[model samples]
Target: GFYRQEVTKTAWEVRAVYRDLRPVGSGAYGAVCSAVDGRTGAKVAIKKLYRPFQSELFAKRAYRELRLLKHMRHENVIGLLDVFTPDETLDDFTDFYLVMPFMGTDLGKLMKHEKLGEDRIQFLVYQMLKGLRYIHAAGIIHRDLKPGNLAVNEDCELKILDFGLAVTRWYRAPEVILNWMRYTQTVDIWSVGCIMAEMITGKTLFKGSDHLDQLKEIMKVTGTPPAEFVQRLQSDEAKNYMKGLPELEKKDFASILTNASPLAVNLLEKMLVLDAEQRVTAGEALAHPYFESLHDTEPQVQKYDDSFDDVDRTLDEWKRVTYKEVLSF
Candidate 1:
């Protein structure tokens, strides 16, 4: 028998620790493969950054993902079990690999299945909010919160994954669309609202081709943006366009989500506000009457790592830091 392996300058054999590797997922940015850990015999997902250091900005994101995942310790947050670099020097250190627990299914796959009942839906949304609570408390916005990023199990458990720089266009908030670039937990809440609608109806709530139509799609369903929200718009073109639209009344949830519960509709309304400040916080969403029966108060004080901050770093410094972090881990 023969096995191919790579030995790095750190005297660590990179591929020797994992065996039976095969591609599980792929995207424009990177490819993920499933592997069996030689040490623990545990199944793991290894995500290899595609030319990770191609640019300083990309490198910075890679470092932030590493630091945040390593620090996060919540049941709903995916754990970064290991990290390694196969490069021989800082100049050559381009590839980044993250090892995490492998989940057999993801929410995107489940969303397509017609069998997802209300109970399971409720549980999934609660878990998402719980994870978001931890993420927001840690001062990280999962800019890419969508069905695809949530790893799930048949038992209705979920672990949020891919904490990186991505914007799932369908799940993007209005604030993000307008380039109103500001760090706000409510931005994530808006994405949650879009996801909420998608899960309920099995169709994207705002299926627009571009930014303008996306805004129109939203306003069509949600009514015109409030005058205050329009006044606050950073883009004059966007503001005028919105203000000039024929005044429309808010559409009823019954029309949009005929099968969803009233409570579910209520919560969705609160989360999908055009004004970021009006969107409910994760904690508030968790405590809404809809989840009162299933509510657990312990999440407010759950002791998870809330220490990692997205501090700026260049490619070289990021490379060195990632190397040190991987070694220390």
Candidate 2:
């Protein structure tokens, strides 16, 4: 039997609607817990966003995440089940929770515990590209794409998580490292390539300690960019630095990804191109022969309104907007 219960040390009014609450994970964002929805008898993960109103940046990120998640609806993307807050009025609305379907583990954890075969890798990467295609169509860039952001269930189903601005340096694209003023969705394709490489080798493809070192590591594999590409870098410092580095030859993908099929290597080569303009789009990657057997048509999502991208709001105003959104649920 299930009964409504209070979550200890938490004062959210919405906690009363859940039962069997237990901590699951925590990060810079805040703590998360698994709980059972008393009304629907379904398992859910609730994230208690930490001090969302602490600063204008944090407030804006919180608002953006909430708005993006609320607008997104796809099997491969994490769905926003609900939003709630303990505050009854706008004056004291400091804490809020985001509800999502609970998954057994993230791809990072799964990779640590078990080695996935080629078939599983194909299926996982296929799902990622499909999800990326959907997100790209909506004019949203999932700047953060790594195994940790990929959630998986017992049945090997996958969903992309974390729609915020934060990104793990390990999976950052080259253009991002070079500080490109306006990167496109292909940045995510680069990340997907890195993730696929990790899945095949059980190791990070570009594990660098710093930005410069990260670029060197990536260059070691992809080889130095052409002079024309280097000339286009926005930063003179980056351009000079690239010129100073010793020229290198591109490593054979087949040799590097020995365990991967030729088709897989070919797709990865297209995805990991140094020039952002040359990288394969998520849609094109789905059409690659590597995913031929797993590919399926999916209706594209509507274009997302990016008007908020340029909007600057005070912390209080962001809090007001976020509070209003929570109430809408």
Candidate 3:
């Protein structure tokens, strides 16, 4: 009787590997769960994709996160520990689960409570600049960046997340809203400028309701660019738009960041430069005197000497790469 046993062709369900699952958050594109890793006996966060095949745009975004997160192994960037497809066959596959380390909280949440110390601020910004330098060196611009997109642990370890919506928005560069189609990595640095300012001020540097409103908000804080910089805008619409707006005196960065050091304010000015060409790169930002203490420490991210080399990447070509990754499953 003990030897007699029945076996089925189907093994345990793929879902069996995780337990104590609970929804931690949900977004426009996906939902996240906090779960106990059955295989490793560790805590993990799982991202469950939603409606990836709803449109070509959506599909491309899904693949972008998959490809980038899988390939990017920086300490300041969320790591893709595992990927799971519940369905055996690709044809029927829809759901995609991305496993990541369970970060205790997000910087956005922590910032709301004003929980960080002054030293922690400098340390966090240093790590962000280091991480961003790695990303830009790879020839990719993280177009979308904000406090909410940054994950953190109790020890102040931070990692950037949510690349699917990595494009310009509230952190929009002036050139973007003015329809300059050809922005550079400086756009991302400009975003970091806003994030750093927000970190110090506990609010968004430019909070606007619409693109036009956003430009106005930026002008209010940063002031209008000079005639020379405005002339640089090849777009007739942009050049004309700037001329119509009243000239604004440049606001002192130190005025708003009253408590910030001179070095911090100086670095912020370089990052938020009105002229994208003059804007400081992440690598340059890291070398500023503000991060003097961080210069000696080794970067958490591995040394990478790679470049994507798609400076002139067309939409169609980008889509092709996206398609390849999505189907390569």
Candidate 4:
């Protein structure tokens, strides 16, 4: 519960060494713990990836994540303080770990307790765009973006983590041998749409497990792709199998959102585009009306002694979840 931090200089290697970590959260293959940077004695986090990454994709994922992150330089985006690779780490081994500056809690954790006010959500939208913009600008597409990938440090600055999904492809991902089933910059953008709607409604509007179920949820709310786009993909093997799907209309997306401000509306519209090419690319997300109020906002993260967010949290306590729940979803 102690949110205090021990500051230290920035470096690419370990600074100081100490461990007083408590398991605050966990992901599919990572355990997030708060600790002091061994090399710098900085208040930081140690994210240890699970051993035996599901496939070779896991190791290659590390390389791709590191390469993309190293190329990125931004305050809004999470910084990769250092990576630890045991000499035993090998071509087939999936185990690896990362050292990073500690953040208070991720957006998903905070959202579990409350429905962020328009202002806080607005703040997040802005910061996330800035981070995404930087990543996309560097020719990297964050293929697996979701609320859990976002974090807020002790200072409350946004840090977009998990670069294992980064790559450079305009409309979709390149010839990825493993992630061949689903790949697209649009997928990341799709997540943005899902996050935005969930933030406002406190509901997983498009909740499902199997990709087909996810598509159904998306179809129910966002509906199927436009006829033309579906037609275009008819020949693509994966898409060819999805033959005869109906066209999705505007009401699906708009109906889910009501009473939101114009900015939220504008950003969601562009992001949830059916066509990957038409979707609001990360570069465009940087310029959306949703962030019009937060343009040029600095990295001055202030602790909120109390705010309406507390009230919302107290009322919406039932919505919170554990790692197991999300995996199941």
Q: Assess the local accuracy of residue 187 in candidate 1 as a C-alpha lDDT between 0 and 100.
A: 80
Report the C-alpha lDDT of model 4 over 9-117, residue by residue, as the tens digit.
Answer: 2222222464676566666656767777555677877666654234444433444444454456687777667665433323323344566677887887877865688
Off by over 4 Å in 4: 1-16, 25-30, 37-41, 48-64, 83-97, 166-184, 234-243, 246-248, 252-254, 297-329
Quick one: best TM-score, which candidate?
2
List the global CA lDDT of all models.
0.78, 0.86, 0.75, 0.58
Candidate 1 global TM-score: 0.85
RMSD of 1: 5.1
Work out the TM-score per prediction.
Answer: 0.85, 0.91, 0.82, 0.67
Model 4 local distance difference test score: 0.58
Q: What tens digits encode model 1's per-residue C-alpha lDDT throughout 1-329?
A: 99988652221235789888777877766678889999999889888877667787776666667777887888888988888877777667667688988888888887876477788888888999999898878767788788888898756789998764553578888877767435488887888788878888888998888887888888888888778778877778777777788998889876899889999999998998777888899999998988887858334533334333355666677677777776677
- List the candidate 2 regions with Cα displacement exceeding 4 Å: 1-12
* Model 2 local distance difference test score: 0.86
lDDT per residue as tens, model 2, 59-171: 88888888889888988899898888878799988999999999989999888897799889998888888888888888889887889999998778889998546536888
Please give, for residues 112-169, the per-residue lDDT of candidate 3 as tens digits: 8755556888988887877777777666676777777788887788888864345246
lDDT value, candidate 1, whole model: 0.78
- Candidate 2: TM-score? 0.91
Residue-level error in angstroms, candidate 2, position 153 = 1.1
